[PDB]
Structure formats: C-alpha cells, structure tokens
C-alpha cells in the first residue's frame, strides 16, 4: 500500500522534502506516497502550502502530523531546537522518521534519540543531501572496487558565505543553547557524512576554530556571536589514514562548496558540489595520455537512470532528496538498509562535537 | 479550478513532463494540476505508469485522452515526428498543447499545425527546454539591459555522441522518411531555439553537413544511414550580425554540450549546458582585476528561487521542464505569453530545414 | 662554427626572437649562436637594446644587419609591408631567414619570395610559434598514432580583444595598401598554420567578415578602418573533412584564445592556448570511468624535456620560440627539415587571402 | 657587468643558466658575464660550459668560487653540500644565489645565517614560486585591501614523483643524508608562499605519513625513513588560521602548489599547474556576482619584461629570470631581495617544526 506521509516545516529543507515525496514514485516506480499532513506555523501558511504542495491538509499542530493514523512516516525539518521532542514523539506514535540534520543540538539529546529509535522498531534516516548524488555514490563504489587502491589521504572543505556580511543581524542560532554549533553544525556535519562514507570511521581529531564576526546588530544594540564562523581539523581514521577537514560560513564567493578528494595508492578522486555532475578520477596511465578524467554524471552512476536516460543532462540538488526518499521508502519495505539511521547519525554528532571540544581545549579528541 | 492534464508518451520526455506537472505548484504555488489521463502502448504499460506517475487512469487510445472533458491541457511527448495528428486533434478538442519537438517532419505539416493553432484560440508551447535554465534566462536579461553592448557575434554548438560508435545499429531514425533530419533535427532545433532567443531572427544560412558513418549493422547485414551525423553553418541574423552554428550526434566525449557565446561591443557571455549552473560574463574592468566572472546560478536568476533559496545548489535538467510547465500554466491563465508557440516554433522548423537544404544544394538559403 | 645571428626589430616578436636565440643552445646543446647585429629605429634604441640583448652592436639600418659578414641567419620581425624586401635581400646576400608571419601583404609578393627562396639554397622558416608547444606537437603525434581514430571535424578559433576599444587610435595597419588583412592577417594566419598541421591542406572555404569599428581617432579627427575585425569560415579539407574557422581582434575578454578541437571516430582532442599546458583527450572507456582526460604538459611531450625534467612546470609562450629556433638551427645543419618554409608558407597565404576574397564576394573559394 | 659562477648543471643548474642569460634581455642593463661553470666529471663541466655559454668549465668548485672575475655564485648542487659551498662563497666575498634548502639541519642553516650577515654580501634562496606575476599581483592586491583582512589560509603542494612503489630506494629517503621528505622537497616552497601572503607562523600542529615504507634496493628492499606526506594546522603571528599540506605521492598531481586566502571582503585562489590564472572574488551586484579569472598579463609584476600582450603564458623558467633580476637589483642597492639567509632560516625552522610536531604529536610554537 502507499506510504502515508507527514511533513513538519516548509523552509529550505521542508520544501525540498515536499518535492521529493511528490516525485519519488514517478522516478523509482511503485506506489506514490500519500501526502497526508503538512505541519507549519502560522496556520494560514500551513494551509496555503499544503494546497500548493498537494498535502491533503495543513495544520499548525505538529503533534497532529506525527499522530495521524493515516501517517506512516514523518519528515521533520523545523528548527533543530525541537528535533528531539518531535523525533521521539513520532517514534513513540509508531512512525518512521526522516530527520533533517542535525539529530539535536547536543550529543546528550542525540544519545537519548538513538536509544528511542532502537526501542521503537521503526526505520530512521538523517537527511544528508550530499551523500545522495550519483557522482558521490559512484565515488564510493569506485573506492570499494579498488579503483584508487588504498586510500592514503582525505582533504575536504565546505565553504559558504551566507554569514560573511557583518551587517546580517544576530539570531538565536548564534547562541550555544538555541543554536548549538556554528559552521560545524550547519556545514561540518555534512562534510563528516561524506568523509566517513569515503574513509570509514574517525578515530581522532585535532581542531581549531574562529569567530570572525564576533558581534552583530540586534535592533538598536548588538549581541555576541557565540558559535564559530569557521573551523579546521586534522583527522586520523580508524584505518590509520590521515585527513584534513574544514568548514566556513564566511568564505566569500562560495555558495555550496562542499569539496573533497581522496588520494590513494593507485589513484585520486576529486569532487566539488558546486559542480555536482563532475567527478575527477586519476589512475596511472601511459605517459603520452596520462591525466585526470572528467567523469560527467550519467546513467552509469547510482540513481541517475531513474531521472534521465542520457548522460550529461545535469542531475540537480533537489533530486538528491528524491534519492534519499527512495532509500527510506525501500528501507521501510524491508528491501534495503538506509544510512545513516539514528545510530550511524549519533557517531557523526560525536565527531562534530569532538571537533568543537578539541578547538576549545586545545587537545586531540579520540573516539572509542 | 486546477488544470486537468493528459499525457501522451512515457519515455525520456514523458517522464520528464510527468515530474514537471507533479511539482509545478510545489515550486511556483497555485493549485496542483490534476493528472487525469496517461496514454501509452501497450495498455498494461499505460496502466503501470499511470499508477507510478499518479495519473487517475491509463489508456491505450490517445484519442480518448485528448477528448476527455476532465482534460484542459495535453502533453505530447512521443520521441517522434508523428505529432501533427495528435497536436491538431487536441486543439480541435479545445485543449491547450505542450508539444515536444519537432512540430512535424516536414515544414508543410508544421505550417498546417501553425494555422490550426491560430484558429483554435488555445495556447501552445514547444518543449525547447534549454531556454528555461536560470543561467540562460539571466543571459537574455543581461543582453536586453545592455550589459554586453550590442551583440557583434554568436558562436554556438550542440555536440553529443549517442551515435558516435560505428557499432551502434541502424534504426528507422536514420531514414529520411521516418526519421527526417539527423543531427539538425535531434540537436540543431535546440541550438536554434537558444540562438534566436539571444540574437533575434535568422535572415540567412550557409551550411555544410556530413554522414560520417555511412552504413550500420542491421539484422546480420548493413543498412544505409540517410541523414546527417553533423552539420555546420554560418549565420546572418536580421540584425545584420554574424553567427557560427553546429550540431553533431557523433562528437566523441560530449553528452549534452549545447554551448554558446555572445560577443558584444561591451562584453561577452558564454555558456555550456554540461555545466548549466555557470554563466561566464566579461565586461571591461580596471587592469589589475580584469577578467571573466563565473556567475554561479542562484536566486538572482529567473526561476531559481522557486526551487531553492540559497545559491549554488545546482539547478537540474528536469527542473527546466518545471519552469516550462509554469510558463504554459501562466499563459493559459492569461498572465504571460509562453514561448515558443506554434507560430514561433514554425520559424525554428524553417531554419533547421533551410540549413539542411543549404548543405544539400551548396547554396545559401534566405529566410526574409 | 656557431651561427651568426642578425635580428631586425625589437618589438613583441623581435624581443621574443632575441630571447630564443640567447638560450637555444642552453636548452638544446651544441654551440650558442652568436648575436652579431641588431637593427632597429631610432639608432639610440638599437644601441641600447643591442647592449641589453647581448648583440655585439646595434644599427638603425636593417641592410647593415643583413649584409654583415659575421651573419649567417636573419630574424625578420618588422612591419608586414617590408617583409618581402627584407627577406629577398637576406636571401640574395646568402643568409638563411627566420621570417615572422606573414610572408608579405599579397599572395603575389609571397609567390616572388617563394621563388627567391628556392633560387637561393638557404633555409627559410616562417614564425608560426603556436605550432611549437609541447601540447600541440603531442596532439599531432596522437592523431598520427590513431588516438582519435579518423578525424571527422575541425573547429578552431582565435579570439583576442586588442582592438575592442573604439578609442584606440587609427594606424596605417588598418589600411589595405599598407596594413594588408586585418584579423585574418594578425590571427587567422596563426589558426591556419595550426589547422593545416592538424588536418592537412584546405580545398575550399566559404567565409563571412565584419568590421565592427569602421572609424577610429586620427590626430584629432577620424580615419576609416579598411580591414576586417573578425571573420568566420566553413572549411572543406583535401581529405573531404569539414571544418569551422574564426578569428577576431574585438572579442572582449580574450587575450590569446587560439583554441581548436579535432573530433574523430574514436576520440576528440581539444586545446586552448590561454591554457597552453593542457591538452584534452577523449577516448572510449568503460562506462564507470568514461570521460575526457586532462593531459598536463610534461617530458612525455615533444620539446618539453629540453626545458624541464619534471611535468607540470608550465612551459611558456616564449619557449615556443626557443623550439622554433632549434628547428631552424637543425635545418641549417642538415639534420631536419623546418616547417613551414617559404613554399609551405605560400600555401598558408593563399588560404587566408582566399578567405578574405570569399568574405568580400559572398562566394566560396577553391584551392 | 656581474661576473657569474654556476655550480651544478642538473634541473636547477640549467634553469639558473637560462635565467642569467636572459635577465638583461628581459629587464635591461648589462648582461651578466658567464665566467665559470663547475660540475663533475670534468668532461661534463666543459661540455656544458660550452652549450651554456660560460667562459670555462671546471671540476673544482672551490677555484670557481674564489675566481676574481666572479661576483655572484649560483649554487644548485645536492642539499648536502649547500652549507660548505655557500659559506666558502661568502668568505671569498661573493654574493650567493642558493637553491633550497639552506642545509639539512637547522643548526647548519643558523651558522650560514651568521656568516651571511658578517660577509656583508647579498644572499637569496631559490623560492621561485614567489616570482610569478600572479603571485606577486596577489600580494599587491592584499596590500591594497582587495580582500579586506585575511581570515584564513589554505595551501597544498601535491606531486607524485614518488607515488610508484617500485621506484628504487635512494640516499634521499634517509633521515641522515636526505633529511626531510615531502616537507623538504615541497613543504618549504609552500611555506615561502604562505608567509609571503600571511606573515610569520606562530604555531603549528602536524601529522605525517610514510605511505611506501619499503622500496627496491640492489637485491631488494630498504626502508624509507622520511615522510611521503604531511599536513598541519597553522596559527599565524596575526592570529589568523591556516591549513597546510604537502605530498610526494599524490597521484595525478605534478606541480600542484595551490593556495587560497579568504578575507573579510574577498577571496584569492591560485594553482601553480595553471600559473597564469589568479581567482579573485569581491562582493558584486547580485546579477553579476562571482569570482573573476584574472589571466596573467602586463598589469602584473614582472610580466611586461617578457611580453607586451596579456595571455601569452608566463612559464616556470621565467620565474627564475625574475629571481635573477631581484638578486641583481639587490647587489646594485636598488631593492632588497627576499628571502635572504635570515628570512630563509625562518622557513627552515617552520618546516622542521612541522616535522617535530608530527613526530611528537604535540604542537610546536615559534
């Protein structure tokens, strides 16, 4: 039978989830999910967006969305603030959960959520857009197949400039409670999701951070920016391999520059999300023709064929979310494991909070 | 009330239209179109895809679908010259038409369609989806605004390699009777759609063409390839301005390389569809910083903000079709003109056929 | 004995020749050419630049440089209108000639020079330095080896913007009588040298052209620009293969964008001179890894190893000229034929002037 | 005219020779006199003296450095002879152009730095990546406030000349006789660029690895003692952060010295494999906002001496002609050359500090 969907939130990621749920069966076949309940505030906004998004109804009561008998799975995309409350309420109501990163603002809340998930017998997945591109998934498979030999180094970054303007006003997100981590939270967690998928688990971090714009306008006065604008870290993976890692929300000229490369004993892979349809692969070759290959995204890569049969017809950012919906759909059907669930996700939260601790204490942080 | 939709065909473009119709209101607001009837063959396939696409019913008879009283607009997406009969039948039934290229194989048939469209007083649009990218629409606006001065030269190409391998079998597409034009028909029409939107109408062409792989495998023997693998032409626009134009279905390594540039008296614009989120702009600057700008697609560009609030989250090929659906939707409502209708579309047919004729005769062809 | 060198001109290409002759033996071995006489105007400039360039003396009289007993080879880098006179004089005096393109202002003059060169039994080479990069030369070898299969299309361009500003003053270079061709002369000839080296001889052209800025400032008033700012042409090669060709001196944002592509039945090669150290090669590959390769210039490519042992240490524009000098030195010594000599070069002049005629008359031109 | 001595004729040796030959061609003044070339064996010194245009070849570098017709000495030999040759030149009253490194050990470099000040001669270290018109233009742009205040540096120097595990073991792979690995071959160059952009390094925390631990030797295997790759987090004297790496086993990279400076009002980005491009972002109106590709041309320092028209790509070897000119002008008292043995010592301290941090697992302060 068709999956009954509830959606909480309609912003950047809320509407992304909505577009995804709308076309998951168009792309992948099977039964179209039923868009049952959309929750958002104010109520008039929830009603108007429910209409245009195609949800059977809208409400300002998020608990209605998680408890409706016709709902099987809940997409949660509202402020990180109430993620634990909403996710745990949905699991308690017997609903599968698609939770936008982060799990919660602290490791402690994430730990409790992880335990609730294991008790509920429902499927969970954390929204990690950037692990779903055909280019990224192709890279993981190429590494798995030995295309670059043994990985010997990872270098990744995630630069954007959405906070570079110092006139941008203060908000609750720039506080430790209310907001949690800064660039590490909004960007770093995404890079960690990609990094651990490529290199395996993180064994140790040593990090440094900075707040470049330390105070911002707050209507007459100013208030202090409490979380980091940028951070960098050196990594040791559980394999013993090295890594470099960074993120920034003040890196002028960058808009979605999640970029990484894996250097191996027999090749190199390189990617930049601002050009998400290109994957660069070097493997040793005859001297006359030796050099990096530009692999342009097409049907040979995971997921792409469900969207288009011809290569070079660029896959979009939003289609990453359709792929993510499908993974959850199949996991609910018992036809495939979804990653990361709340257990896998908690590890990612531990890593990013470990980097924040390292930057503050000046000490390396180790993981089991 | 919401627009009632009929869809004919389910391949490359059929699925693309279906995804567009499903998310058009999600992206742009208003009422979601009602997916009423899907027509395809065989019947079991029409029924299977109606279910997964979310259409109320499938049918093996398209004539049924176009006359359904619950239908207001008909998407015609067969990868075929066989569009005249379906297009005119829809218009005759008082339905608006979203037609995939070409209008027909012959200019004569396209001309009949153009007249039926005017007589019908229903809206029409041809699926020239490469005119819908935020980057392309931004370029047109920059030109209109005087950002590069007066255009002095156009250079465009559309290379792909889907027929490059001589091993690839013969098919009816390679006949003049059933396939019509070659590269000019498959790819050239698209380049013309973009070119004339940038530079204005074509006054004259002088062209060359080649069939470089003259025979292909066919049922244990070979059959002759009757249309062109590639073609090039020098253009004069009605403006008096010069142009260069090419297309190829045998250009090894290229997958969707619709690439163009407009050189003006005060700057230059350059674009490549394989990187559809980048627009290159040169305008004179102080010597120390002078150079082309990489304009990364974001909410400053037409259409983008309906899909994502943050720049650099790559807009995709399929989202062009959502934009196209919205343009038609607004034209139906009487709140904008959709381009190109069958009148504008006919001109495109005349141009590609004029290029083909010029290549065959070795003489220039005039259009005005 | 070391080659005795005369140099006429000290501008863009004159100084490029001077730097090349100075280090040709440093790169390639053998005896360093002797820099004997530098000719330039005015005399004070010739003396000054001779000193800094390392030439034994400078003179204001090009005839002195050509006739000097210690001179064996003459580099001619002066205005196109004097090329025939200077080249013929050098040949008549028994000197080998390195002549900057073009040969002359007319096909008629180029023919006379071609005849004079054969009459003389001295070596000649025309200075088409874009045929000298390791990337270009590697591409020619890859095509010969079958790396892209059978070539089926050529597409080339040469955009620059040195004349894009309409306030840039008029000069005699912009008349047909004294300046000759416009963009076709300054840029087109370079693209032809590359194009024919890749694709073989041209059989036919059909061209269009424009002068975008028809009048320019001249000493408070205005004067007419008589030659083209841009031109485009469709090509048929002697092989039967198709081509696209263009040039422009008004293409805003481009500085040395000589760019070309050869598409073949088993691959594609693509190049852009603004990134002269990269050659793009597509060949079929398994679907998981299929794509163009970025071949970064290194010691695997012709000429590079004479300048650097390590790949990725970018080869420079000026080092193309060092390669060109060595080709001439080896030709003079009987150890290699240099291309293009005045005979090969005459064909290039015929092609560029045929394009100009085609654009003027609106008719194709056959060769 | 400057009397030139040249010691060594391999990669850098020829590069120096080509530079000395064209330095006056490009920049004017008097062509330096190519007096004595020293190398071994004797036949090679004479052969190359002839093709390089030096008045004579010799197998004894000591006689070349003490020659009265010599004013300046280019030293391009193996790292293990740099101290001896450099101090001998300075003691003979000759100016010195020295290829990196100053020496294998910081202790030796310090002694060299002492001798340099006491000799009153000019010294320059061959950090040629600081000589490109693009790099020099970047420094000037930062000085004009084009990107505001620098807030982060990220740099790398990847190459793959040791990536093939079948490449034989050599003395260069010994701590004793090769010194540092990737940090010495590549790291030093990245430091020269980094401090030129960001000022002095205050602190580093580093990691390193030997990826290929054993290599074929005579009958077989011998252990590799120095690092194939290293990374570090940087704190500059300014307080600004940095990321730093180098590798000799990064497959596909040939000369990927790449750096980026992010500031409060813009970003600059560069990659030596495309040394004629400098990427600059500054905020712009929404419709046209984005990075600019600045193609190297006569607006950039040094370029016009080589070509009057932009986009005619400046090459690696021309960086060395620029370096030669800077030394010449320093000798003539018309401009100070960087880095001298004093500035050079600081660079040795940083790279060795990074090596120490990686070995001990502790940050190192300067």
Q: Is D247 on the interface with A (CB under 8 A)?
A: yes
Would you tell me the crossing angle of helices B12-28 and A43-53 to the nearest 10 degrees? 170
The Cα–Cα gap between A307 and A315 comes to 8
Q: Which two tokens stand for residue B261?
A: 């540039």
Cα–Cα nearest to A323, from A7, A12, A19, A4 = A19
Contact status of D186 with chain C (Cβ, < 8 Å) = no
For chain C, domains (ranges, CATH) are 1-126 (3.40.50.720), 127-367 (3.30.360.10)
Is the CB of residue D323 less than 8 Å from the CB of residue D124?
Answer: yes
Interface residue of D128, D299, D316, D324 to substitute, partner C, most C CBs within 10 Å: D316
Q: What distance in Å separates the CA atoms of residue A37 and residue A3, rounded to the nearest whole number?
A: 12
DSSP state of C11: S
Of all residues in chain B, the one with the smallest CA distance to C250 is B265
Q: If you ran DSSP here, which 8-state letter would residue C303 be given? A: T
Looking at the complex, does the CB of residue B312 fall below 8 Å from at least one CB of chain D? no
Compute the CA torsion angle D323, D328, D329, D335 (nearest 10 deg): 60
Which one of B295, B298, B304 makes the best mutation probe of the D interface by having the most chain D beta carbons within 10 Å? Answer: B295
B146–chain D Cβ distance below 8 A for any pair: no
Query: Of chain B residues 62-81, which have a CB less than 8 A from chain A?
Result: none
What would the 3-class secondary structure string for chain A be? CCCEEEEECCCHHHHHHHHHHHHHHHHHCCCCCEEEEEECCCHHHHHHHHHHHCCCEEECCHHHHHHCCCCCEEEECCCHHHHHHHHHHHHHCCCEEEEECCCCCCHHHHHHHHHHHHHHCCCEEEECHHHCCHHHHHHHHHHHCCCCCCEEEEEEEEECCCCCCCCCCCCHHHCHHHHCCCHHHHHHHHHHHHHHHHHCCEEEEEEEEECCCCEEEECCEEEECCCCCEEEEEEEECCCCEEEEEEECCCCCCCCEEEEEEEECCEEEEEEHHHCCEEEEECCCCCCCCCEEEEECCCCCCCHHHCCCCCCCCCCHHHHHHHHHHHHHHHHCCCCCCCCCHHHHHHHHHHHHHHHHHHHHCCCEECC
B268 touches chain C (CB under 8 A): yes
Q: What does the alpha-carbon distance between residue D182 and residue D257 come to, in Å, rounded to a whole number? A: 13
Maximal C-alpha separation, chain B: 66
- What is the C-alpha separation between D137 and B290, in angstroms, rounded? 12
Q: Which of these, C320, C319, C300, lies nearest to C310 by C-alpha position? A: C300
What is the phi/psi pair of residue C232, to 5°?
A: -135, 150
Residue of A nearest to B313 (CA): A317
C12 is in an annotated binding site: yes
Residues in C closer than 8 angstroms to B155, CB to CB, are 157, 246
Smallest Cβ–Cβ distance between A282 and the set D231, D232, D251 belongs to D251
C-alpha to C-alpha distance for B37 and B211, rounded to whole angstroms = 41
User: For chains A and C, what is the number of CB pairs under 8 angstroms?
Assistant: 51
Contact B96/B124 with Cβ under 8 angstroms? yes
User: Which residues have a Cβ under 8 Å from the Cβ of D43 and sit 6 or more positions away?
Assistant: none
Cα separation, B68 vs B64, whole angstroms: 6
Annotate C80-94 with b (16+ C-beta within 10 A) or e (fewer).
Answer: bbbbbbbbbbbbebe
| C151-159/D214-217 β-pairing | unpaired
Task: Mention every residue, 6+ apart, whose C-beta is less than 8 A from residue A190.
Answer: A101, A128, A129, A130, A158, A258
Closest by Cβ to C293, choosing from A147, A291, A299:
A291
Q: What chain B residue is nearest to C211 in terms of C-alpha separation?
A: B152
| A96 annotated to bind ligand | no
D252 close to A (CB below 8 A) = yes
A344 Cβ contact list (under 8 Å, min separation 6): A126
3-state SS track over chain D? CCEEEEECCCHHHHHHHHHHHHHHHHHCCCCCEEEEEECCCHHHHHHHHHHHCCCEEECCHHHHHCCCCCCEEEECCCHHHHHHHHHHHHHCCCEEEECCCCCCCHHHHHHHHHHHHHHCCCEEECCHHHCCHHHHHHHHHHHCCCCCCEEEEEEEEECCCCCCCCCCCCHHHCHHHHCCCHHHHHHHHHHHHHHHHHCCEEEEEEEEECCCCEEEECCEEEECCCCCEEEEEEEECCCCEEEEEEECCCCCCCCEEEEEEEECCEEEEEEHHHCCEEEEECCCCCCCCCCEEEECCCCCCCHHHCCCCCCCCCCHHHHHHHHHHHHHHHHCCCCCCCCCHHHHHHHHHHHHHHHHHHHHCCCEEC
Q: How far apart are CA A271 and CA A294, in angstroms?
A: 10
Contact D24 C52 (CB under 8 A): yes
Q: Mutual orientation of helices C43-53 and D11-27 as an angle, nearest 10°?
A: 160
Residue D24 Cα, gap to closest chain B Cα (Å): 26
Across the interface, whether the CB atoms of C264 and B252 are under 8 A apart is answered: yes
Cα Rg, chain B, nearest whole Å: 21
The rounded distance, in Å, linking the Cα atoms of D44 and D18 is 17
Cβ distance B311 to A23 less than 8 Å, yes or no, reads no
B296 in contact with chain A, both atoms CB, cutoff 8 A: yes
CB C186 within 8 A of CB C161: no
**Contacts with C191 from chain B: Cβ below 8 Å:** none
Burial of A116 (0-12, 13-18, 19+ CB in 10 A): buried
Instruction: Residue B210: list chain C partners with CB under 8 A.
Output: 152-153, 242
* Inter-residue contact A24 to A325 (CB < 8 Å): yes
Structure-token match 């048929």, residue found: C236
Helix, strand or coil, per DSSP, at residue B237: strand
Measured between CB atoms, does B129 come within 8 Å of chain A? no
The span from the CA of C264 to the CA of C268, in Å, is 6
Phi, psi (deg, nearest 5) at residue B245: -150, 140
* A230 has a chain D CB within 8 A of its CB: yes
In eight-state DSSP terms, residue C256 is S
Distance of CA A174 to the CA centre of its chain: 20
- At C161 the three-state DSSP class reads coil
Chain B residues inside the 8 Å CB shell of D146: 289
Judge: B252–C244 Cβ closer than 8 Å, yes or no: no
> Contact A281/C294, CB-based, under 8 Å?
no
């Amino acid at each position: 039978k068709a999956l009954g969907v509830a959606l909480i939130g309609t912003g950047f990621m809320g509407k992304c989830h909505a577009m995804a749920w709308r076309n998951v069966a168009t792309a992948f076949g099977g039964l179209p999910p039923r868009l049952e309940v959309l929750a958002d505030m104010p109520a008039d906004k929830a009603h108007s967006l429910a209409s245009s998004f195609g949800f059977a109804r809208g409400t300002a009561d998020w608990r209605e969305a998680v408890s409706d008998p016709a709902v099987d799975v809940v997409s949660i995309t509202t402020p990180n603030g109430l993620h634990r409350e909403m996710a745990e309420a949905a699991l308690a109501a017997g609903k599968h959960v698609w939770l936008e990163k982060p799990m919660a603002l602290s490791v402690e809340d994430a730990q409790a959520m992880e335990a609730a998930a294991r008790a509920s017998d429902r499927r969970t997945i954390i929204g990690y857009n950037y692990t779903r591109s055909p280019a990224f998934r192709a890279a993981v498979d190429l590494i798995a197949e030995g295309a670059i030999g043994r990985p010997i180094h990872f270098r990744g970054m995630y630069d954007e400039d959405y906070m570079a303007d110092p006139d941008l006003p203060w908000s609750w997100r720039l506080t430790r409670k209310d907001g949690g981590l800064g660039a590490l939270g909004d960007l770093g967690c995404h890079l960690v999701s990609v990094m651990v998928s490529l290199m395996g688990p993180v064994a140790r971090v040593y990090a440094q951070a900075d707040t470049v714009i330390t105070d911002r306008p707050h209507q007459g006065g100013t208030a202090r920016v409490e979380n980091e604008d940028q951070a960098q870290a050196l990594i040791r993976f559980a394999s013993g391999t090295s890594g470099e890692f960074s993120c920034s929300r003040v890196a002028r000229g960058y808009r979605c520059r999640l970029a990484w490369e894996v250097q191996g004993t027999e090749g190199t892979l390189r990617f930049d999300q601002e050009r998400m349809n290109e994957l660069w692969l070097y493997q040793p070759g005859r001297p006359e023709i030796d050099g990096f290959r530009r692999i342009l995204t097409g049907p040979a890569q995971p997921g792409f064929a469900a969207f288009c049969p011809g290569g070079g017809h660029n896959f979009g950012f939003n289609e990453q979310k359709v792929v993510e919906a499908e993974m959850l759909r199949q996991a609910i059907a018992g036809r495939g494991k979804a990653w990361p669930d709340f257990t896998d996700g908690l590890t990612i939260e531990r890593v990013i909070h470990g980097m924040a601790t390292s930057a503050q204490t000046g000490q390396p942080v180790n993981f089991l």
